[PDB]
Design a binder for this molecule. Structure first.
Ligand SMILES: C[C@@H]1O[C@@H](O)[C@H](O)[C@H](OS(=O)(=O)O)[C@H]1O[C@@H]1O[C@H](C(=O)O)[C@@H](O[C@@H]2O[C@@H](C)[C@H](O[C@@H]3OC(C(=O)O)=C[C@H](O)[C@H]3O)[C@@H](OS(=O)(=O)O)[C@H]2O)[C@H](O)[C@H]1O
Ligand SMILES: [Cl-]
Ligand SMILES: [K+]
Ligand SMILES: [Zn+2]
Length: 440
């Protein structure tokens, strides 16, 4: 037997992403981790930090996205999101890419395929057996699950495919019943161009009873519209910020001005814009408050090179300094390829990304540190590096301890993808004999 760096070897497509978060959660010395496995089904494992023993991975549910007739080989937009409720049941949200006509008429957007799903562990703190609840709307993409101190659960998602509002559904009974969706970002026809307002949001905990939300805007072009009829692309621009007080129900911008829901593009441009990116195309990151309560934002952006996705995009850091939004500088200086990363912030000046990037054909995951509020980052220790690969990463694990902070997927082909749990220094190893016994 020997220790290997990966805890599973069956990921497919993009098995992780920052937008489906938490992908893993730490509680009482156990780190729970989830990712997308064969047929895009959600898999979950756990690591017991005191005993050194892994459990799983176990399949938590059955995704429609892995059983489509044709189309893209892997969809990936329904990789799993995790939450542990106040009774210890583990919830997995997964499988949605906006539903389809068989689920009903989507009242808050359009559809594509794959009904959004909700599984729960049969017993508290036991990841081995699962049951379907599917008590949320099937018209969902991009699950983001937040539990407040009183146990209330907010599930944020897009209520359909591109041309849909973003919403949350709230549960006060540990995820067993959800209230109807509440729209907080509006999709609608533009009155100036042949496009629909569309959005991508990242919601996470703020301080107290606040939830904070960063988002970029998608210019959702009609077919044949746009410059020289380029049609529908992934064109996205800019980044915005607002806050949600879960005690009062009210939303506000960084200055505390209250917003009427759902927020339209026109109000967002007036009230919640954080950083314009000009002609640069964006891919959203995440947001976190510093120790003075001021929001920091990771936003990826890059030059449009004419591709359907524009071109490669690099992570940039933005922050509220108490009076104005500042920043926009790249985390990795002079880098022009693809980078992604999540960050931690303490004092407003002190920001650390764990970021992935490529050097030649190799994948790198390393820490980058700023002490000047995000204008300059310097690379510190490398946590994982793999030749002839690229990394998909999770957001930082909820309540992470130093040994287990982020999940990584070593993309080589689009199946058989090795899955890693990494900490300050490197991977949380698993016995190979144990892994082979457990797989799948
Ligand atoms: C649901 C949409 O239905 C139709 O309108 C159409 O098929 C559309 O495709 S599109 O014209 O290319 O936009 C469908 O949209 C896809 O699903 C997503 C959605 O918003 O519904 C989108 O995916 C996000 O953005 C992608 C760029 C990303 O894809 C990864 O990253 C890149 C890249 O940066 O070049 C390329 C690969 O597609 C993939 O590695 C998605 O990530 S995921 O983990 O694969 O899910 C996701 O973040 C997007 O609009 C379409 O892919
Ligand atoms: Cl990119
Ligand atoms: K990502
Ligand atoms: Zn679109």
């Amino acid at each position: 037997d020997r220790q290997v760096g990966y805890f599973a070897d069956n990921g497919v497509g993009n098995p992780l992403a920052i937008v489906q978060h938490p992908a893993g959660i730490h509680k009482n010395g156990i780190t729970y981790v989830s990712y997308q496995g064969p047929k895009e089904d959600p898999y979950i494992a756990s690591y017991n930090h005191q005993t050194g023993q892994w459990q799983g991975p176990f399949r938590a549910g059955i995704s429609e996205l892995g059983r489509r007739d044709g189309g893209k080989k892997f969809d990936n937009n329904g990789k799993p999101t995790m939450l542990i409720d106040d009774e210890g049941y583990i919830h997995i949200f997964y499988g949605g890419h906006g539903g389809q006509a068989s689920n009903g008429k989507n009242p808050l957007g359009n559809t594509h395929h794959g009904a959004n799903k909700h599984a729960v562990s049969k017993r508290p703190y036991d990841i081995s057996q699962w049951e379907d609840l599917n008590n949320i709307t099937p018209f969902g993409t991009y699950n983001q699950a937040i539990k407040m101190d009183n146990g209330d659960i907010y599930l944020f998602f897009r209520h359909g495919a591109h041309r849909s509002d973003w919403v949350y559904q709230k549960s006060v009974d540990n995820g067993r019943t959800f209230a109807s969706p509440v729209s907080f970002l509006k999709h609608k026809r533009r009155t100036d161009i042949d496009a629909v307002d569309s959005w991508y949001a990242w919601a996470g905990k703020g301080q107290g009873d606040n939830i904070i939300v960063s988002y970029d805007y998608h210019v959702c072009w009609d077919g044949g519209a746009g410059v020289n009829g380029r049609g529908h692309t992934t064109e996205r621009h800019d980044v915005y910020f607002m806050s949600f007080n879960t005690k009062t129900g009210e939303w506000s911008n960084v200055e505390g001005e209250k917003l009427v829901l759902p927020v339209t593009r026109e109000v967002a441009d007036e009230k919640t814009m954080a950083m314009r990116t000009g002609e640069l195309w964006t891919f959203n990151g995440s947001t976190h408050l510093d120790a003075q309560g001021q929001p920091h934002i990771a936003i990826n952006a890059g030059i449009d090179k004419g591709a359907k996705t524009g071109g490669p995009k690099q992570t940039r850091h933005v922050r509220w300094n108490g009076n104005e939004w500042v920043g926009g500088d790249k985390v990795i200086p002079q880098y022009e390829r693809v980078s992604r990363g999540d960050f931690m912030v303490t004092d407003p000046e002190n920001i650390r990304y764990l970021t992935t990037y490529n050097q030649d054909n190799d994948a790198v995951l390393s820490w980058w540190q700023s002490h000047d509020g995000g204008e300059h980052f310097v690379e510190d220790k490398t946590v994982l590096r793999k030749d002839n690969a690229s990394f998909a990463i999770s957001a930082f694990i909820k309540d992470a301890i130093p040994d287990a902070q982020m999940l990584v997927a070593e993309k080589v082909s689009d199946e058989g993808i090795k899955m890693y749990l990494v900490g300050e220094e490197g991977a949380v190893t698993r016995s190979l004999v144990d892994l082979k016994t457990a797989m799948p």
